[PDB]
């Protein structure tokens, strides 16, 4: 009995954290979209400033030392954006560590008690709450989802080099893809299925 109350408290103590953290994840993600768009734009500009020569065009000719004095501005105005992205990704990293720690706490409590609780008592659904087993399963699935998403985000974002001006001009699509490939809103449906707290 008391063990079942232990894991029950653990579970409906862990969930609200998952809810709020998901909200934070979401908001932090939404900031990244326009930033990335603007970065694609700067990439496009800087792309279309090597296709000239600037030594042979009538007007600009009277302007020595321009091509450089331009680039060395576009790059700064890009680098600032990219550091903003870095900040967002730091937010993401914070949230994955939070969730992972909490989920591991839950499993550890369970493993601490799962010898004096027949798995049949673990595995039986009630009228207002899914099966404990299914709850732990969903927790584990949330943790794995967050981890994979974060890490794929990073190994996309840290492969940006001024110098591959083609790849840098495809970010806004590869990103969106990396988002539209997990299962549709896991945390959303899990949160619902557990809304009736227990």
């Amino acid at each position: 009995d008391r063990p079942l109350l232990a894991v029950q408290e653990a579970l409906k103590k862990c969930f609200p954290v998952v809810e709020e953290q998901q909200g934070l994840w979401q908001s932090a993600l939404r900031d990244c979209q326009p930033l990335l768009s603007s970065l694609s734009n700067l990439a496009e500009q800087l792309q279309a400033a090597q296709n000239l020569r600037f030594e042979d065009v009538p007007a600009l000719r009277a302007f020595p030392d321009l091509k450089e004095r331009l680039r060395r501005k576009q790059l700064v105005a890009g680098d600032i954006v990219l550091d903003k992205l870095g900040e967002r990704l730091a937010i993401l990293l914070k949230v994955r560590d939070m969730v992972s720690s909490h989920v591991e706490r839950v499993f550890q409590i369970y493993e601490q008690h799962a010898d004096t609780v027949g798995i049949d008592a673990v595995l039986q659904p009630s009228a207002v709450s899914p099966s404990v087993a299914d709850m732990l399963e969903w927790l584990q699935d949330i943790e794995r989802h967050y981890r994979k998403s974060y890490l794929k985000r990073k190994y996309l974002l840290s492969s940006i080099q001024w110098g591959d001006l083609a790849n840098i001009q495809a970010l806004p699509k590869a990103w969106d893809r990396i988002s539209k490939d997990e299962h549709q809103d896991l945390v959303q449906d899990i949160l619902l299925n557990v809304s009736f707290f227990l």
Binding site: E44, A48, P58, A59, Q74
Partner: protein
């Protein structure tokens, strides 16, 4: 006397701000011109004219800055009757920067009205927006000088 210097400072500030605002409007204009042109692969003239008007507002800004520079140099000379040179060289850096900038803007208007391949057009729109003749130390510089006074 130094009150004139403080006025020079605050005027520098407001002047740069007005500059940026005008540059924003003008960038909008030039965007419209590029798009209208490229849609045509005899009425854009009104656009080109009001862009020129933007340039004239710019020019007024430039001449006000030049007057400020001259006054500062004069106060320097007056104190040379027998730090303040700081202020003169500050305003001189600012002036030379913005003046070359204005020249570049004039050339980009000139060339932009009728351009060939689009890549020139993007490079020109850029050269307008990023105004690549302001090392941005200006801001620091201005603040650095501004805080020497109120």
């Amino acid at each position: 006397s130094a009150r004139k210097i403080k006025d020079n400072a605050a005027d520098w500030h407001n002047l740069i701000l007005k500059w940026e605002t005008l540059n924003d409007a003008g960038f909008t204009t030039a965007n419209n011109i590029a798009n209208l042109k490229i849609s045509l692969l005899e009425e854009l003239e009104k656009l080109c004219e009001e862009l020129q008007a933007t340039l004239d507002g710019l020019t007024k800004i430039q001449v006000k800055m030049e007057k400020l520079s001259s006054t500062t140099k004069g106060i320097c000379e007056l104190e040379n009757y027998h730090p303040t040179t700081h202020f003169y060289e500050v305003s001189h850096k600012l002036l030379e920067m913005y003046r070359k900038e204005l020249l570049l803007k004039r050339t980009v208007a000139k060339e932009l009205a009728h351009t060939g391949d689009p890549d020139l057009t993007l490079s020109y729109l850029s050269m307008w927006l990023h105004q690549p003749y302001v090392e941005s130390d200006s801001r620091l510089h201005l603040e650095s000088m501004l805080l020497e006074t109120g």
